């Protein structure tokens, strides 16, 4: 399948904590990905012969900023792609990827943002997860904070990752308290909050926008992992999550036959459907990614080995693993990203290197 066709290193020599292809590319435009590390975001274009063409960076005004994460969306009126970034300052920046201008920013967490994700159906709904133990849902069309997911029954330590399900009806989050929590956003209260957020225009009213305080997850478990839970993804109604214990677990809330939409807040069972083990990934903040179709899953480890699982099989435990190594790639890989058409897989590393793998 994949062959290593190129690599480079960014000039700052700090970790690249994240990478994301733009899956909102226009037909006929080249494939583009963003990296985040140090206090910058950088865009590169993929071309033939393994060329990774350097484009342009956004560099934060603050030399002490450290960007951790990025996520792509598009402007809902204009269709132009937008890039959100955030990190240790707890500030969300919305970046024009063409000019690399910061169109606008959001403050609130004040504390480190560990992940950003956009709703799979609504390009304006942005989820941020924080070192302050809360998640927040923003509407980046009307610049409103829709809701904060927190409270003593929410996470009790840094939230490290979160993922919306297929239709963006609910979010699974996870973090340093070892737990995974479900937050439904299709409730009456939440659907209304979102609609009211679209109705909010501060020039046409006197009121501040009111945020929902959501203090109770719709399900919680600490039975999956026994350390920091640092990456979570939906797989239909099942979950894939990992800690720093060299495993990705495929599980679901409740018993084997339980419908995800009939699970109650007090559900105390989970069901384990499989576990994909690998080696040398005991450090935390190491994310896997999946291709657009969720046919496959890629994870790098702390010494520069890639694992790829073919999930195109009848049950999760039947996943087929391939590994991808290069003799010059020995630094920790923090995250992978597939292009939308699945032909390229990029890994970024703690020594600021970028690795290109083509199918």
């Amino acid at each position: 399948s994949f062959k290593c066709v190129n690599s480079l290193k960014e000039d700052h020599n700090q970790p690249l904590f994240g990478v994301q292809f733009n899956w909102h590319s226009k037909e006929g435009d080249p494939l583009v990905f963003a990296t985040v590390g140090s206090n910058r975001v950088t865009l590169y274009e993929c071309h033939s012969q393994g060329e990774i063409r350097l484009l342009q960076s956004y560099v934060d005004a603050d030399a002490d900023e450290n960007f951790y994460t990025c996520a792509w969306t598009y402007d809902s009126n204009t269709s132009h792609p937008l890039l959100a970034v955030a990190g240790s300052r707890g500030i969300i920046r919305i970046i024009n990827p063409i000019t690399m201008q910061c169109i606008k920013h959001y403050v609130g967490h004040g504390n480190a943002i560990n992940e950003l994700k956009f709703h799979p159906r609504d390009p304006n709904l942005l989820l941020s997860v924080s070192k302050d133990h809360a998640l927040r849902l923003w509407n980046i069309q009307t610049d409103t904070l829709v809701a904060i997911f927190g409270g003593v029954e929410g996470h009790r330590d840094e939230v490290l990752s979160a993922d919306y399900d297929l239709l963006g009806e609910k979010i699974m989050s996870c973090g340093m308290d070892h737990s995974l929590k479900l937050w439904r956003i299709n409730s009456k209260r939440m659907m209304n909050a979102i609609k009211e957020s679209y109705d909010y225009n501060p020039n046409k009213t006197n009121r501040p926008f009111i945020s929902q305080k959501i203090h109770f997850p719709d399900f919680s478990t600490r039975d999956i992992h026994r350390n920091y839970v640092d990456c979570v993804r939906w797989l239909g109604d099942l979950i894939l999550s990992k800690s720093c214990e060299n495993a990705i677990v495929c599980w679901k809330p409740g018993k084997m036959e339980d419908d995800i939409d009939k699970i109650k807040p007090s559900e105390s069972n989970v069901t384990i459907l499989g576990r994909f083990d690998y080696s040398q990934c005991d450090i935390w903040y190491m994310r896997f990614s999946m291709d657009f179709w969720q046919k496959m899953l890629a994870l790098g480890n702390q010494v520069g080995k890639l694992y790829v699982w073919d999930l195109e099989v009848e049950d999760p435990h039947k996943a087929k693993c391939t590994t991808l190594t290069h003799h010059k790639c020995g630094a920790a890989i923090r995250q992978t990203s597939f292009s939308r058409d699945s032909s390229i897989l990029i890994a970024v590393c703690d020594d600021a290197s970028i690795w290109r793998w083509d199918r």
Partner: peptide, 4 residues
């Protein structure tokens, strides 16, 4: 658990 260390970050690096």
């Amino acid at each position: 658990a260390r970050k690096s």
